[PDB]
Amino acid sequence: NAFANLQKVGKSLMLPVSVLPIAGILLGVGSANFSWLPAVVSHVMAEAGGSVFANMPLIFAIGVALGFTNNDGVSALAAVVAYGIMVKTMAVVAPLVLHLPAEEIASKHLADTGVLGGIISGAIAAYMFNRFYRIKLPEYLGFFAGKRFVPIISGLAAIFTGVVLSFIWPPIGSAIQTFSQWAAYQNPVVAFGIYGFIERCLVPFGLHHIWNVPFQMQIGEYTNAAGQVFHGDIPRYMAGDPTAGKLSGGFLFKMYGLPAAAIAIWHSAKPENRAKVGGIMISAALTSFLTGITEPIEFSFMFVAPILYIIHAILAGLAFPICILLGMRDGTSFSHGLIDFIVLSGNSSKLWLFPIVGIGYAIVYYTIFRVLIKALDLKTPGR
C-alpha cells in the first residue's frame, strides 16, 4: 500500500534521470572554458545543461505523472499546469505567512521545495487523472469531460496544495538552512563529513540541490590582488584557489564506489536474471563513472535495500574527511565524474591518490554489497 507506491515512484523516476547524464556532460564540457572550443560553443552547451538542470523539477513532475498513469500525455500536461500553479502560489503566499518582505524568501530559499515540488505536482496530476479521466458530464458540458477535465481539477488542487505547503515547509526549509549554515563554522573535517552524509540523505527526496548551494557557492571567499572575487568552494576551485577542493570526496564514491555497488548488485542475481540485470547495471555504472550522476544507481536499490543506502551515505560522508586529511585536491562543475575529474585538473594536488583510494572504496562497496545482499537475501535488481 505504501512500499509498493514508493517502489513505483522510484521506478518512474528513471525516465527523468535518463536525460541528466547528457546535460551533465554538456555542462561540464562547456564550463571548462577550453582554449580550443570557440566561446559560442561552451556558451550554448553550458546554457543547455543549465536549462535541463533548472527544469529538473518539471521533468520530475512529468515523470511521476506518467509513472502512475500508464504513460499518458494528458497526465504530463496536467502535471505541467499543476507545477506552475503550485510554484507561483507558494511564492505568492509564503511571504505573507512568514511576514518577511517577499525578498528574503527568495534570497534565503524558504519557499523553493525543489524537486520534491515536482514529485508533489506529478502525484497530484496522476491521482486526478486516475480519478477523473473517465468522468461523464452532461451532454451540454460534454466538451470539458473525460481527459479534458483532468487539467482543470489538476490545478484547482494545485492552488490549494500550494497554499497548504506555504505553511508546512518554511519550518522545514528554515531547518535545512540553519544546519547547512551551522555546518560551515563547524570545524573543517566535521563540516564536510556532515555535508557528504546529509547530501546522501537528501538526494532521495530531491533537495540535496538546495543543500549543496551554501557549500558550493557561499561558504568561502577569496580575492588575490587583481583577481576577481569568488565566494564558494566549487567556484573557488575552478578559480584555482589553494583551499577549495573540499568537495574532492565526491570522486571516491561517484567514480569508484557506486560503480562497485552496481557491479556487486549485478553479480548477485538469479541464475537467469543475470543477463537482463547486467546491461542496466553496466550502463548505470558507466554513467556514474563518466558524468558523476548517481541517481540511476541509487534509485535501483534505495527503496528495496534501505540499509545499503544508509551504509552508502555513511561511506560518502567518510569520503570527504579523508580526502581533506590526505589533501586529495580536485574540483567540480556540477558533480564529480571522469570529465570533471580531468578538465578541472588544474591545481589538482595529490591527484595520484584518487585511483588507489578509489580502488579501495570499490573493494569495500562491492564487499558489503555482495555480503549483505546474500545474507539478508535483499531483492535488489535481479533478485
Ligand X SMILES: OC[C@H]1O[C@@H](O)[C@H](O)[C@@H](O)[C@@H]1O
Binding site for ligand X (CB under 6 A): 20, 203, 208, 212, 250, 293-295, 334-335
- 146 versus 240: smaller Cβ distance to its own copies: 146
Produce one character per residue of 36-51: b if its CB has 16 or more CB atoms within 10 Å, e if not.
eeeeeebeebbeebbe
Q: If you search the block for the grid coordinates 505568492, which residue do you land on?
A: 92
Q: How far is the CB of 377 from ligand X (least distance, A)?
A: 28
Q: How far is the CB of 291 from ligand X (least distance, A)?
A: 8
Nearest in space to 212 (alpha carbons), one of 188, 190, 180? 180
Closest approach of ligand X to the CB of residue 219, in Å? 15
State which residue, 299 or 366, has the beta carbon closest to its own copies. 299
Kindly state whether residue 18 participates in binding its own copies, applying the rule CB under 8 A.
Answer: yes
342 binds its own copies (CB under 8 A): no
Contact 313, 197 (CB under 8 A): yes
Dist. CA 347–CA 241, nearest whole Å: 8
For the CB of residue 55, give the shortest distance to its own copies in the complex, in Å.
5
284 contributes a contact to its own copies by CB under 8 A: yes
Binds 37: which of its own copies, ligand X, none (CB < 5-8 Å by kind): none
What, of its own copies, ligand X, none, does residue 54 touch, CB below 5 to 8 Å by kind?
A: its own copies
| Coil vs helix vs strand at 48 | helix
β-partners of residue 222 are 230
Q: Which of 8, 108, 148, 267 binds its own copies (CB under 8 A)?
A: 148
C-alpha cell of 236?
A: 573557488
d(CA 272, CA 198): 37
Measure the CA–CA gap between 281 and 65, rounded to whole angstroms: 25
Of 1, 101, 107, 139, which one interacts with its own copies (CB under 8 A)?
139
Query: What is the nearest approach in angstroms of ligand X to the Cβ of residue 142?
Result: 11
Query: Quick check: 65 binds its own copies (CB under 8 A)?
Result: yes
- Considering only residues 40 to 59 of the shown chain, the ones binding its own copies according to CB under 8 A are 40, 43-45, 47-48, 50-52, 54-55, 58-59
Question: Per rule CB under 8 A, is residue 261 in the interface with its own copies?
Answer: no
- Residue 73 sits in the site that holds its own copies (CB under 8 A): yes
DSSP 167-215: TSSHHHHHHHHHTTTHHHHS-HHHHHHHHHHHHHHHGGGT-HHHHHHII
* Selection from 173, 248, 165, 255 nearest residue 214 by Cα: 173
Q: Which stretch binds its own copies (CB under 8 A): 108-116, 217-225, 283-291, 317-325?
A: 283-291
The percent of the chain in helix, strand and coil, each rounded to the nearest 5, is 70, 0, 30
Are the CB atoms for 114 and 207 separated by under 8 Å? yes
- Cell digits for 311? 551504509
6 binds, among ligand X, its own copies, none (CB under 5 to 8 A by kind): none
Please identify which residue in 8, 37, 84, 311 interacts with its own copies, judged by CB under 8 A.
84
* Rounded least distance, CB 7 to ligand X, Å: 13
Distant-in-sequence, close-in-space partners of 34: CB < 8 Å, separation ≥ 6: 42, 343
Binding pattern for the stretch 287-326 against its own copies, x by CB under 8 A and - elsewhere? x--xx-x--x------------------------------
Question: Which residue do the cell numbers 575552478 mark?
Answer: 238
208 binds, among ligand X, its own copies, none (CB under 5 to 8 A by kind): ligand X
- 121 touches its own copies (CB under 8 A): no
Under rule CB under 8 A, how many of the chain's residues touch its own copies? Answer: 72
C-alpha distances (whole Å) from 135 to each of 76, 138, 158, 266, 267 are 18, 10, 19, 45, 48
Whichever of 21 and 331 has its CB closer to its own copies, that residue is: 21
**CA–CA dist 23, 49 (Å, integer):** 4
Rule CB under 8 A: say whether 141 interacts with its own copies: yes
Stretch that binds its own copies, among 158-166, 205-213, 302-310, 341-349 (CB under 8 A): 158-166
Q: Least separation, in Å, of the C-beta of 151 and its own copies? A: 4
For position 118 contacting its own copies by CB under 8 A, the verdict is no
